Design a protein around this ligand. Structure first.
Ligand SMILES: Nc1ncnc2c1ncn2[C@@H]1O[C@H](COP(=O)(O)OP(=O)(O)O)[C@@H](O)[C@H]1O
Ligand SMILES: Nc1ncnc2c1ncn2[C@@H]1O[C@H](COP(=O)(O)OP(=O)(O)O)[C@@H](O)[C@H]1O
Ligand SMILES: Nc1ncnc2c1ncn2[C@@H]1O[C@H](COP(=O)(O)OP(=O)(O)O)[C@@H](O)[C@H]1O
Ligand SMILES: Cc1ncc(C[n+]2csc(CCOP(=O)(O)OP(=O)(O)O)c2C)c(N)n1
Ligand SMILES: Cc1ncc(C[n+]2csc(CCOP(=O)(O)OP(=O)(O)O)c2C)c(N)n1
Ligand SMILES: Cc1ncc(C[n+]2csc(CCOP(=O)(O)OP(=O)(O)O)c2C)c(N)n1
Ligand SMILES: [Mg+2]
Ligand SMILES: [Mg+2]
Ligand SMILES: [Mg+2]
Lengths: 546, 546, 546
């Protein structure tokens, strides 16, 4: 009996638990995707590889298994590579699998069809990259790519399959023996007791301790241990954007609504899978109070992240589950409690800030402003705490992050570390496919334009996605003009563009709403029915910042 | 009070325990090296940066602290980068620090003095690379370089210091607060009990178990735990080249002299800091018996090393110290012992091969052969078990590895994973500088030519190095000729070259020997006196392999 | 009849005029070098690939045909790559040919012998790179490499030959038809008449015109046209270092001895194969007088060199031969003459500077200084105007460049654009091999250490090289000390090292000299006899600058 490279690739993926392939067909991988579908894998075909890649990336975040993006050679590979780079930047496990052309023609730069040394091009832009020349090495190649994607700091891996590989024929028994079911692809890594003891001694010296939960903490799926660490220590916490919901955002220990005071006045800060990068002002400047006022404890699987920005006095290296559980054990044995004055200081700021926002969510101005629209969507998420929220834009992003409380972990998927516009539709597809939950995508109209053709994809697979476009006719605002009076302003779109009518062009439901009540009712009907829906919400073009 | 970039660099290195800088002076780092020496660091200046880089590399292997190599820009940086890449390949911790030119001129490719984007050029060839533009970030830049060099799988890191950096002046108190004394640069990483349990179950099922000790196990400096694992399990072991001496090479559990049988007939193999790369035939082929006859347990800090070549049924990820002690604990609690007939099989094969070799060591040919010369040096090392052996060549390498038993760990420094000719004199310098031990460098005459100029360096610092050149007039052999009769053959050197005269050029002792007894007496005199010595040993040009 | 990869490689090289291979043997190219020698090519084997690479680089400068450097994989390839990058920086045609390992193992990063994707690693560091997978494409691969090396701006090209290539067998007639004898490898490129007209108009407007001859003009081998352009226009000229001797350095139109005045006070400058890089202060600052005082005409084959640093009002793009001849034809038809007052100004400045230098050449100090030693060697070169001068160091370089007049083109080979220490012995080998001329290598003692082992290569091939080491015991000077009193100073060597004894080690002539008369006598004897000779010249350790 004989097998070929086509079947070995699919067999290796199936053996290792891959159930979905995100892709765009074409030479030389169309028949690979057809075979994947015939062998029971779900194959999702997109309108652009970048969106297939974004889907695979967030599938990795949601599941701790590498999402698979399959593309053609050079131009399609480059489209996927952009998403793979973003996956690496965000620590999402993902494998970009791409066909490539004739090795000897490419090696001589003779102008092959879609010629590119895709292995060499990918390496500066992703965590690891491999190329498989022989059918008998497909099993090990897939194993190397899975291990690179999910171990250590997870990230994007490139796997290059030359067209010639797929049609190679080898003995079927030799083939099956060549496959590898990876054992312990993402091993636990436990910290040394001395590192835990040092972290505990710093934490116990704190007068104003603070926990910061990053999306690495959400990714780790150690929800019970993270919640117990916060609740049994009594230490207030601030969630980063995609750690919202790991503990309910309304939790009594959250200082999220008092973030400025917590960051400025704390003295010991425990970072749980959160980098001191631009989102935390690099641990420097007035955001963190006076220089010398902060000691940092940091839990991270990547030892090289310690001392990346400022001195880390108590580095704790290992997987978050192991590290949090070791810390929690120590707190259970010896911990005085968190200082009461500090908690009361933060509770007062939290209540004052919430009270200041509260009237803004109720103001019923016409045109609808960002606050009143998002006040309605806040209620949707409270009523549907298992729904997934996709969110991108500028005002649409920053205001939604502050106003919409999340209640369950890994339900908020947004622009991430690189602040990428364009993840929305790819993320919505993967969220619906991987979780089976309803998806609410809250999109700026500029952000939506980077991936908006994928609404046809959403319709084609009848995915339960409700898209809300905050249509303010522009980037940030819709009011800029050309001072020469000849063209539109550089930051505007066609006024009152009807994105809902675009959705209807592919058979989805389109709604045009102009009030918070209309928005609420339309979202409710979409999420109750599961029908692909796009709601075009008129937002005041002068509202928001900038 | 004010400080400057010059002083901040030296302060940051001193703060983190750097005591030695290997370098070659020149613009823009001559004054940096002078200040290091003025501030009490030992500064070793070489004749070529590649040798200064090799010294730093093996200094990292010997100490588990990054060896520091300091170079000028573009051409000197490239010389050091070749050694940094070799350090990375061998998992040796090392920091290449280079000056670079004017950022704005290099960025526009205008033809600066020694113009090169050294940061961009280094990244494909080493583990990590950083460039420091502002004096206040020197402390963090040094901290990042240190952590990347020694954590995880150790390797070579590039630290780029533009010439303008050194002259920047900042407040001395701000300068001091910006320095970082790295906490736990190389953290312990402990494996999960489930992974150890899996490995123990495989090991207990073995009828013919084998331990392979790689140079990762030697580097880890967990000597007592590694020896206890071998001795208390009773499992025979094979040491890779630079793991020789971790346990005495004459240890009764060593199957090193029955290596071929041990690899072929074992059923369970425990790899301890050793890769299934070309040195172990990729775990494939006749070296390892019949396909499917082997189950591998592998201990390694790098999770991505698992399944690199063949399926690893029991991966154990962590630092070697933590993992071998966890295994040892499990063996102590439940171990039936290694099967006796397996040890008997290997012991018989070991004694038979040692006997086959014994007559070759005493046969006193004329001219001297490799075996009889190396028989004298075997005795030297047996009599001086704390001396360091540097070794490179072809016959001179492979025959010395088999004939010269090592008795203490980390005393054998050789060509390593890339089989590099050229590490000899650099390794000898760092060995002598770092340890204070006598050094015996056993060098092929071709191998020696790659770094031979550094005998002046050895003389200049009065280092206790005894160099033995196995002078067979060529690469592998001295007999090849030009079939056209016009030139020397491509693989020979000047016949009867007297490298001892080259040593005397720099005030060292130079000796010419023709017999094993003359060799033994000359080596004894050199190593007793500690004077820099080069012994030119006349070896039969027709002796050896090839 | 059948042929193989080994033979096709040698056949392709022979077909295109390759007569010499510089190399270091080893797997997988030892048998390739043997076959080359058996088929009549001269094969020069070095002690380190970087020196073989330097030889190939200057062979390209000397001959306008790519020098061939042949190396093993990863570590030897990296050594050669450093010289290939330097060739690219200096615009020297060169091909680095390296063996590489098993493509499928390297592509999976499984740890092949000397594993490296050398194609991908080479590309950021040279002009072009190709890899040849199939024997039938060897002919085209060699054609591609030759064309890339010598066309456009010449430079270094990497040609990768996997080990499996050499033993492929194909039909001998197919093999013969697959070979390519390159037609017009370095085509002439003629400038548009309108660019020449523009340049002539600027030149005719000049009150103080100046020609600058760079080593591109020397490389071009348009000697008669360049000399005619200078002599028939009557415009004074300044030669860059390796354009010295294109016209005799004593030529009445040379302003080389009045360089500062020529650059500062000229108004129109004609660059002929010379970049406004660091060697010409980027066309900025006080070197060039007041801002706005200069108009540049530039002749270069590389259109992208125009406006690299400052605005070029008359760019002329093409090969120097064609462009100089087109300028010359314009001058012959209509030219008023260079203003004779400007020539008078430069003549007076030249005569004053030479008179200020004359006493220092005759000052018979003890110990010998740089000036009195170089005064002797100035006379040597005057008496031997066909000899080749290799020169490197700091004081030994800068003072020799000023003091030693060259009389014939392409006789001065030095550190070049990157200021590399280490080109000396490789350049000397290639000069002697390619030209058959006597070679005088004037070497700093620090500079010599970077390639000094190759004196054995010089002896092995009995090359007419006379090496003079300016032994001042250190870098720039020999007087620096360790302020802690523990070690030698960072910039010194063993005091009164006898490098001449190192030459005796390999059967060459060693001489120690202390006065200019002893030096002159020793050089005369060495260059008269053609015997490989190294003269150790004692230089005052406090003389010179820096
Ligand atoms: N399973 C894990 N265990 C430990 N650390 C992890 C794990 N997964 C990701 N990380 C770390 O979590 C961090 C996430 O940082 P960031 O992406 O900056 O989160 P946010 O943007 O929420 O701050 C990264 O440093 C990554 O190494
Ligand atoms: N402290 C350590 N703990 C665990 N593994 C280590 C440690 N230091 C190095 N290693 C691993 O040891 C291995 C060395 O393998 P190799 O260099 O191939 O040794 P040899 O050449 O002797 O087989 C590498 O896989 C490296 O990741
Ligand atoms: N045959 C040629 N015809 C025209 N320009 C050439 C030719 N060969 C080299 N060049 C140019 O000559 C210049 C040499 O510049 P440089 O190397 O800076 O010379 P120097 O260092 O003497 O100034 C380069 O710009 C290169 O493109
Ligand atoms: C790929 C990419 N391109 C451009 C940007 C810059 N950018 C930041 S926010 C934004 C759009 C903001 O407008 P919108 O989504 O309509 O949100 P609004 O503020 O109007 O609610 C853009 C284009 C980006 N982050 N990513
Ligand atoms: C940098 C580098 N260049 C070339 C080689 C190829 N090579 C392998 S062994 C060797 C020298 C073997 O000759 P020698 O050192 O004299 O040992 P012998 O067998 O003669 O005792 C060389 C050049 C290499 N491994 N590394
Ligand atoms: C590869 C490389 N490394 C380092 C340097 C820095 N450098 C510039 S000149 C010089 C040596 C100067 O000393 P020497 O050759 O003895 O000449 P001297 O002034 O003493 O005559 C060095 C090492 C360089 N140019 N290239
Ligand atoms: Mg908008
Ligand atoms: Mg030899
Ligand atoms: Mg000197």
């Amino acid at each position: 009996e004989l097998t070929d490279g086509f079947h070995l690739v699919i067999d290796a993926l199936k053996l290792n638990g891959i159930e979905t392939i995100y892709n765009v067909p074409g030479i030389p991988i169309t028949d690979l995707g057809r075979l994947a579908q015939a062998e029971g894998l779900r194959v999702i075909s997109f309108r652009h590889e970048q969106n297939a890649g974004n889907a695979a990336a967030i599938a990795g975040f949601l599941t701790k298994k590498p999402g698979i993006c399959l593309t053609v050679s050079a131009p399609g590979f480059l489209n996927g590579l952009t998403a793979l780079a973003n996956a690496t930047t965000n620590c999402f496990p993902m494998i970009l699998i791409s066909g490539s052309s004739e090795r000897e023609i490419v090696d001589l730069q003779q102008g092959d069809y879609e010629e590119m040394d895709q292995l060499a091009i990918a390496k500066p832009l992703c965590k690891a990259a491999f190329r498989v020349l022989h059918a008998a090495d497909i099993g090990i190649g897939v194993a190397r790519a899975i291990r690179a994607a999910v171990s250590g700091r997870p990230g994007g891996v490139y796997l290059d399959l030359p067209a010639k590989l797929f049609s190679q024929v080898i003995d079927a028994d030799l083939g099956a023996r060549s496959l590898v079911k990876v054992i312990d692809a993402a091993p636990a890594q436990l910290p040394a007791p001395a590192a835990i003891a040092r972290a505990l001694d710093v934490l116990k010296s704190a007068e104003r301790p603070l926990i910061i939960l990053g999306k690495g903490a959400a990714y780790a799926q150690a929800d019970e241990a993270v919640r117990a660490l916060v609740e049994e220590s009594g230490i207030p916490y601030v969630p980063m954007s995609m750690a919202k919901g790991l503990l309910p955002d309304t939790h009594p220990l959250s200082a999220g609504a008092a973030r400025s005071t917590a960051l400025k006045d704390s003295d010991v800060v425990l970072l749980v899978g959160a980098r001191l990068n631009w989102l935390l002002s690099h641990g420097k400047g007035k955001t963190w109070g006076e220089p010398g006022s902060k000691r940092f404890i940091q839990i991270d699987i990547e030892p090289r992240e310690m001392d990346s920005n400022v001195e880390i006095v108590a580095p704790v290296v290992g997987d978050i589950g192991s590290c949090v559980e070791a810390l929690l054990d120590g707190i259970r044995k010896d911990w005085k409690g968190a200082p009461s004055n500090w908690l009361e200081t933060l509770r007062g700021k939290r209540e004052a800030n919430i009270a200041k926002m509260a009237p803004k969510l109720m103001k019923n101005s016409s045109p609808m402003c960002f606050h009143s629209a998002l006040g309605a969507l806040r209620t949707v998420i409270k009523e549907r705490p298992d729904a997934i929220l996709v969110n991108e834009g500028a005002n649409t992003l920053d205001l939604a992050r502050g106003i919409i409380d999340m209640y369950q972990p890994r339900k908020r998927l947004d622009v991430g570390t690189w602040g990428v516009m364009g993840i929305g539709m790819g993320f919505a597809v993967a969220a619906a496919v991987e979780t089976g939950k309803p998806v609410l995508a809250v999109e700026g109209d500029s952000a939506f334009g980077f991936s908006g053709m994928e609404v046809e994809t959403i319709c084609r697979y009848e995915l339960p996605v409700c898209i809300v476009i905050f249509n303010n006719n522009g980037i940030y605002r819709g009011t800029d003009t050309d001072p020469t009076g000849r063209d539109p302003g550089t930051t505007v779109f066609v006024k009152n563009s009807r994105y809902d009518k675009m959705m209807e062009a592919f058979g989805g439901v389109g709604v045009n709403v102009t009030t918070p009540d209309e928005l609420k009712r339309a979202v409710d009907e979409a999420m109750n029915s599961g029908k692909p829906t796009l709601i075009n919400a008129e937002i005041d073009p002068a509202a928001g910042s900038e």
